[PDB]
Amino acid sequence: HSTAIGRVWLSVIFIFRIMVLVVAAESVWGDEKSSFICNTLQPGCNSVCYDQFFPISHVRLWSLQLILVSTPALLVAMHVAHQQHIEKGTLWWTYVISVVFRLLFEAVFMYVFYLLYPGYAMVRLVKCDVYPCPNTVDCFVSRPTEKTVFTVFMLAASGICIILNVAEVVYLIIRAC
Amino acid sequence: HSTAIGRVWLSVIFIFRIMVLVVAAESVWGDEKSSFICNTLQPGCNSVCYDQFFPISHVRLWSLQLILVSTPALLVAMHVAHQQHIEKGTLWWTYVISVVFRLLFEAVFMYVFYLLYPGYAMVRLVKCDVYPCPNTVDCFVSRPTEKTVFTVFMLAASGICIILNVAEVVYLIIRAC
Amino acid sequence: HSTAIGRVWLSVIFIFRIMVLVVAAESVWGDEKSSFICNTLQPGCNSVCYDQFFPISHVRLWSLQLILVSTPALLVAMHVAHQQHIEKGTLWWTYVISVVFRLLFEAVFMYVFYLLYPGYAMVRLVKCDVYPCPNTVDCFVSRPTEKTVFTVFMLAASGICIILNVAEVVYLIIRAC
Amino acid sequence: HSTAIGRVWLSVIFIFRIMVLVVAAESVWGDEKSSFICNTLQPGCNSVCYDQFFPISHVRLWSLQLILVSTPALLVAMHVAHQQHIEKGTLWWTYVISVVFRLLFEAVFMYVFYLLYPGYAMVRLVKCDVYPCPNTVDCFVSRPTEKTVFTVFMLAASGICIILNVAEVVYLIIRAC
Amino acid sequence: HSTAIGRVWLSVIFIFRIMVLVVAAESVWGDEKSSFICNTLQPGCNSVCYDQFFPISHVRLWSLQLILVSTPALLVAMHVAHQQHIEKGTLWWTYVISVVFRLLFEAVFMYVFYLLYPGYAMVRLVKCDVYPCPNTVDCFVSRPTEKTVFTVFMLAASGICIILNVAEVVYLIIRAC
Amino acid sequence: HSTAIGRVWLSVIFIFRIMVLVVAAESVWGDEKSSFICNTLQPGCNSVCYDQFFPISHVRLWSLQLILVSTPALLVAMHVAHQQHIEKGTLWWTYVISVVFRLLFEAVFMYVFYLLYPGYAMVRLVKCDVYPCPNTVDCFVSRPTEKTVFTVFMLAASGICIILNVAEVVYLIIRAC
């Protein structure tokens, strides 16, 4: 019932994103806070500086994005199961709405990533002047390069997903006409 | 036998809550106590201050809420299985009672969350004057911003669940009349 | 073959107890010993004080109670399978004996909990004077409030199980007469 | 083909032992070495004293005992599967030999437990004079009381298994005559 | 439909690589950063030196390589499932393209491994002069020999995979002619 | 198609080895490096001494041995599946070659174990004079006795496997004649 190009490629990219996120969360981001250390004797400086520079981790943002993108499909599948229960083209329009919602969810999460972390690259040293840290202190980020590489992978996959969703919408519209 | 709107949407929101809780418990709240540090030399100040400011963690409250909400459905399913065994509209009234009980459980857990943690936001610094901490000491909370974001997500999902349960009850009453 | 009220409610409460124990063991009681600290310079004081005040953890007692309660049912199921193998009301009396044994196991574990930990509430500070700790030292318990809440939940569930088992026995006796 | 009393009771006790061992290994014995501390400034004293007083942990001995007891049954099942393949009372004698081997394995492991750890109870303080510890030093054992309780449980279960195996052998001999 | 030699040998080598990577990631590379220590009093020297000498771990590179190699096959299987859905030699050419893409992915990952880590062997001591480390400091790598052995295993397996893919392409071309 | 004695006994011993390795890896060898401490103030001495005395852990060697022994059987099973696909005594000779390869893999791993760790027993104290450790320092090995016991178990099982493989080859040759 769905288009040929859409489902297969979207599922493959989604599985790739899930695998990459699993690897990165299991390994790369495990000690992002425990090994985060600042050059100071001020108690509590490490925690406040980490909170200031990492309001929410990249892994958590990616997990939330994947969940939000998935629940359209779960809702559509539940509605299809309910239709089957009733049995014992509004479905097409519902599928279009779900695809559109997935596209907006991806775009919103990309914009949030841009707002929170301008730039894909992660730096080794950050300057933190948040209370109670006196003046400005230097803090050091765990595995900036590996995190940058995984961030690039996730952003490229998300952009590919966005383009694929747009192409799927265009193809479905052409099918309608 | 049940209403069209209710089961699908409630199940989707419940699965979303489960996924969010799994992510947050696995990652965000893991080091809520180990990295909780106060600015003092008093032994035992950290533990008593953490206990005073976090009588029970947000993750544990959400887990208890999900279990309490779930066991109505488990009890109804067990009763249905027992009815099937007997085979080898009291069921409708039992379903209404279970939905009502789920609604009250959600409302009670929301009220408990309001009582224990007034306000969704978590602060970086807390003032603790609990024995044996001398005078008032400053203590620093791990990942206040990420915890605030996840708390907002869970509260919004719980409110949506409450509204959906109320709408389901109203729809079932309209069906009765 | 069994009573209507008994099996469903007992299974629901048992599953609730299992879920609560899983959550508490995974989260609440993980650092009960590592974060247990006393105010002293005496080596080995922490370990002996923890052993004196926690001969066996609440989680371990609950796990042992659940296993002991379960093995009646496992033995009855194995005997039923053996009867099926023989095929290729002594069963009723065996079921009554198993229910009675479960009731006594619950009562004995409740009495043991009363003996070891008089009172549901857990205190923040304990006074320990066990060798080699000099005079009396103060030791601080991790998460007393959350542990108290979970203890209350488990005790209420166990009491409900005891009452349900007694009611099941009475109903079965009435069926006999 | 087997006796009525034997298989069911032996399987129930074996499952009980497995559950108890799982709980104890997951929880009780996790920090047996990390929290093992001696009252000395000598480097390496903790490790040598722990090795001297715990050549092999109770959990590891129980795991080895369970594996050794199990592999008779696994070998018998594999031989039965091979007989089925051949199809596409030597079996009785093989079953007797397997039961006898299980009985000797249980007895040997009980004797090893007696040799290594005379007495079920675990003490809080041990006196260690192993090189390079100077003179005699005091070392403190983690959770002696809980370990003693679990040791008592495992020893009682093992003794019940031994008695059950002996009774099964006697019953099978009576069947032969 | 596929060649005799290719699928079986490629699957066996892929499973071998997966098993080796699982073992190494679980055990060898767990403490690559936590036990990475430099001989200095400069705060943050350890983290920057580890980032400089390990931009991305060997385990993460191998995981990414395996995922990238796998997704060709997953995409081909999804396309085959879509063809089956349509049912309710373009496939040959698609299989050739997927095999070619796997070969290039293996070659690119081998070249990346050569660029990042010239030489299979890992050294015990590295010289790090990255800010803020003053002058040049010595840092010590955890388990260089075991990591070297596992690196040799993975590189040999990857080379065997490359040769097997080339042979499969040649055999398929010969089949075409 | 295979011999009666071979498959059953080899599978039983292989499963026993897998279980023992799982237990030992989960428990005994977990802190082989973290608790490895030398008597010195030299930074990096612990890591270089551990690398010098443990180039690769016993658990990792056993895991590699089991994987290498297994992949013959996996390759043979894959070839059998391919033969089944073709359907939709070269197999005997392939089975002999696989058994021979397993025997050589076991022998080679035994020889490697002899080379790396002469003697089954593990000592408490080792003398390390590897740079940058000044002169000779004493280092202490975690759980030498338990590791020795598990090493003896694994070596005995491996020797039994070697003898069983040789006997299987002899029996198959006798079958050929």
mmCIF file with all atom_site columns, N, CA and C in Angstrom, chain A residues 2 14 16 22 50 58 62 76-78 82 84 86 91 99-100 103 109-110 133 150 156 177:
data_model
loop_
_atom_site.group_PDB
_atom_site.id
_atom_site.type_symbol
_atom_site.label_atom_id
_atom_site.label_alt_id
_atom_site.label_comp_id
_atom_site.label_asym_id
_atom_site.label_entity_id
_atom_site.label_seq_id
_atom_site.pdbx_PDB_ins_code
_atom_site.Cartn_x
_atom_site.Cartn_y
_atom_site.Cartn_z
_atom_site.occupancy
_atom_site.B_iso_or_equiv
_atom_site.pdbx_formal_charge
_atom_site.auth_seq_id
_atom_site.auth_comp_id
_atom_site.auth_asym_id
_atom_site.auth_atom_id
_atom_site.pdbx_PDB_model_num
ATOM 1  N N  . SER A 1 2   ? 2.027   1.172  0.641  1.00 0.00 ? 2   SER A N  1
ATOM 2  C CA . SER A 1 2   ? 2.963   2.280  0.719  1.00 0.00 ? 2   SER A CA 1
ATOM 3  C C  . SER A 1 2   ? 3.856   2.302  -0.521 1.00 0.00 ? 2   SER A C  1
ATOM 4  N N  . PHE A 1 14  ? 16.937  3.998  9.867  1.00 0.00 ? 14  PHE A N  1
ATOM 5  C CA . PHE A 1 14  ? 16.519  3.993  11.265 1.00 0.00 ? 14  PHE A CA 1
ATOM 6  C C  . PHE A 1 14  ? 17.275  2.932  12.059 1.00 0.00 ? 14  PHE A C  1
ATOM 7  N N  . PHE A 1 16  ? 20.221  1.724  11.273 1.00 0.00 ? 16  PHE A N  1
ATOM 8  C CA . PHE A 1 16  ? 21.596  2.207  11.375 1.00 0.00 ? 16  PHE A CA 1
ATOM 9  C C  . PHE A 1 16  ? 21.741  3.215  12.509 1.00 0.00 ? 16  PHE A C  1
ATOM 10 N N  . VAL A 1 22  ? 23.225  2.906  20.059 1.00 0.00 ? 22  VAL A N  1
ATOM 11 C CA . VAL A 1 22  ? 23.501  1.880  21.060 1.00 0.00 ? 22  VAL A CA 1
ATOM 12 C C  . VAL A 1 22  ? 24.992  1.815  21.354 1.00 0.00 ? 22  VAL A C  1
ATOM 13 N N  . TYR A 1 50  ? 29.599  21.240 34.294 1.00 0.00 ? 50  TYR A N  1
ATOM 14 C CA . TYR A 1 50  ? 29.075  20.207 33.409 1.00 0.00 ? 50  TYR A CA 1
ATOM 15 C C  . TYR A 1 50  ? 27.620  20.477 33.053 1.00 0.00 ? 50  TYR A C  1
ATOM 16 N N  . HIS A 1 58  ? 24.195  14.407 24.235 1.00 0.00 ? 58  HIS A N  1
ATOM 17 C CA . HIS A 1 58  ? 23.875  14.115 22.842 1.00 0.00 ? 58  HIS A CA 1
ATOM 18 C C  . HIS A 1 58  ? 23.137  12.786 22.723 1.00 0.00 ? 58  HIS A C  1
ATOM 19 N N  . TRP A 1 62  ? 19.439  12.138 21.106 1.00 0.00 ? 62  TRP A N  1
ATOM 20 C CA . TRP A 1 62  ? 19.219  11.190 20.017 1.00 0.00 ? 62  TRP A CA 1
ATOM 21 C C  . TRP A 1 62  ? 18.184  10.136 20.399 1.00 0.00 ? 62  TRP A C  1
ATOM 22 N N  . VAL A 1 76  ? 0.186   4.372  14.220 1.00 0.00 ? 76  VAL A N  1
ATOM 23 C CA . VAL A 1 76  ? -0.438  3.918  12.978 1.00 0.00 ? 76  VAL A CA 1
ATOM 24 C C  . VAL A 1 76  ? -0.662  2.410  13.014 1.00 0.00 ? 76  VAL A C  1
ATOM 25 N N  . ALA A 1 77  ? 0.320   1.657  13.516 1.00 0.00 ? 77  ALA A N  1
ATOM 26 C CA . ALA A 1 77  ? 0.171   0.209  13.615 1.00 0.00 ? 77  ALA A CA 1
ATOM 27 C C  . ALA A 1 77  ? -0.941  -0.168 14.586 1.00 0.00 ? 77  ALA A C  1
ATOM 28 N N  . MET A 1 78  ? -1.043  0.546  15.710 1.00 0.00 ? 78  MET A N  1
ATOM 29 C CA . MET A 1 78  ? -2.127  0.290  16.652 1.00 0.00 ? 78  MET A CA 1
ATOM 30 C C  . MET A 1 78  ? -3.483  0.585  16.023 1.00 0.00 ? 78  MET A C  1
ATOM 31 N N  . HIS A 1 82  ? -6.542  -1.978 15.386 1.00 0.00 ? 82  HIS A N  1
ATOM 32 C CA . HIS A 1 82  ? -7.920  -1.688 15.768 1.00 0.00 ? 82  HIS A CA 1
ATOM 33 C C  . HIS A 1 82  ? -8.866  -1.840 14.582 1.00 0.00 ? 82  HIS A C  1
ATOM 34 N N  . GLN A 1 84  ? -8.383  -3.922 12.099 1.00 0.00 ? 84  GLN A N  1
ATOM 35 C CA . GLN A 1 84  ? -8.516  -5.369 11.958 1.00 0.00 ? 84  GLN A CA 1
ATOM 36 C C  . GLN A 1 84  ? -9.516  -5.925 12.964 1.00 0.00 ? 84  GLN A C  1
ATOM 37 N N  . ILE A 1 86  ? -12.032 -4.287 14.225 1.00 0.00 ? 86  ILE A N  1
ATOM 38 C CA . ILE A 1 86  ? -13.338 -3.880 13.712 1.00 0.00 ? 86  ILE A CA 1
ATOM 39 C C  . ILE A 1 86  ? -13.793 -4.828 12.610 1.00 0.00 ? 86  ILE A C  1
ATOM 40 N N  . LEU A 1 91  ? -6.982  5.491  5.816  1.00 0.00 ? 91  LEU A N  1
ATOM 41 C CA . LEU A 1 91  ? -5.703  4.937  6.247  1.00 0.00 ? 91  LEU A CA 1
ATOM 42 C C  . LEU A 1 91  ? -4.548  5.574  5.483  1.00 0.00 ? 91  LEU A C  1
ATOM 43 N N  . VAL A 1 99  ? 3.792   10.414 8.314  1.00 0.00 ? 99  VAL A N  1
ATOM 44 C CA . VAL A 1 99  ? 5.065   10.721 7.664  1.00 0.00 ? 99  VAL A CA 1
ATOM 45 C C  . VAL A 1 99  ? 5.413   12.194 7.847  1.00 0.00 ? 99  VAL A C  1
ATOM 46 N N  . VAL A 1 100 ? 4.419   13.069 7.685  1.00 0.00 ? 100 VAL A N  1
ATOM 47 C CA . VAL A 1 100 ? 4.634   14.500 7.875  1.00 0.00 ? 100 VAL A CA 1
ATOM 48 C C  . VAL A 1 100 ? 5.073   14.788 9.308  1.00 0.00 ? 100 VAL A C  1
ATOM 49 N N  . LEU A 1 103 ? 8.620   13.883 9.799  1.00 0.00 ? 103 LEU A N  1
ATOM 50 C CA . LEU A 1 103 ? 9.496   14.885 9.198  1.00 0.00 ? 103 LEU A CA 1
ATOM 51 C C  . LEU A 1 103 ? 9.646   16.105 10.102 1.00 0.00 ? 103 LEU A C  1
ATOM 52 N N  . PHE A 1 109 ? 14.109  18.358 16.094 1.00 0.00 ? 109 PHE A N  1
ATOM 53 C CA . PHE A 1 109 ? 15.249  17.862 16.857 1.00 0.00 ? 109 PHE A CA 1
ATOM 54 C C  . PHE A 1 109 ? 16.567  18.359 16.275 1.00 0.00 ? 109 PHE A C  1
ATOM 55 N N  . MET A 1 110 ? 16.652  18.474 14.946 1.00 0.00 ? 110 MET A N  1
ATOM 56 C CA . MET A 1 110 ? 17.842  19.062 14.337 1.00 0.00 ? 110 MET A CA 1
ATOM 57 C C  . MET A 1 110 ? 18.019  20.515 14.765 1.00 0.00 ? 110 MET A C  1
ATOM 58 N N  . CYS A 1 133 ? 31.947  28.828 40.935 1.00 0.00 ? 133 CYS A N  1
ATOM 59 C CA . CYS A 1 133 ? 33.313  28.817 40.424 1.00 0.00 ? 133 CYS A CA 1
ATOM 60 C C  . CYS A 1 133 ? 33.869  30.235 40.407 1.00 0.00 ? 133 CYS A C  1
ATOM 61 N N  . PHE A 1 150 ? 30.951  10.616 16.231 1.00 0.00 ? 150 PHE A N  1
ATOM 62 C CA . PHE A 1 150 ? 29.623  10.019 16.359 1.00 0.00 ? 150 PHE A CA 1
ATOM 63 C C  . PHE A 1 150 ? 28.527  11.053 16.120 1.00 0.00 ? 150 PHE A C  1
ATOM 64 N N  . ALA A 1 156 ? 24.456  13.287 9.953  1.00 0.00 ? 156 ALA A N  1
ATOM 65 C CA . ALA A 1 156 ? 24.329  12.887 8.556  1.00 0.00 ? 156 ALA A CA 1
ATOM 66 C C  . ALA A 1 156 ? 23.160  11.930 8.365  1.00 0.00 ? 156 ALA A C  1
ATOM 67 N N  . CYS A 1 177 ? -1.896  12.705 -7.517 1.00 0.00 ? 177 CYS A N  1
ATOM 68 C CA . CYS A 1 177 ? -2.226  13.368 -8.775 1.00 0.00 ? 177 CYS A CA 1
ATOM 69 C C  . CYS A 1 177 ? -1.979  12.445 -9.963 1.00 0.00 ? 177 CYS A C  1
#
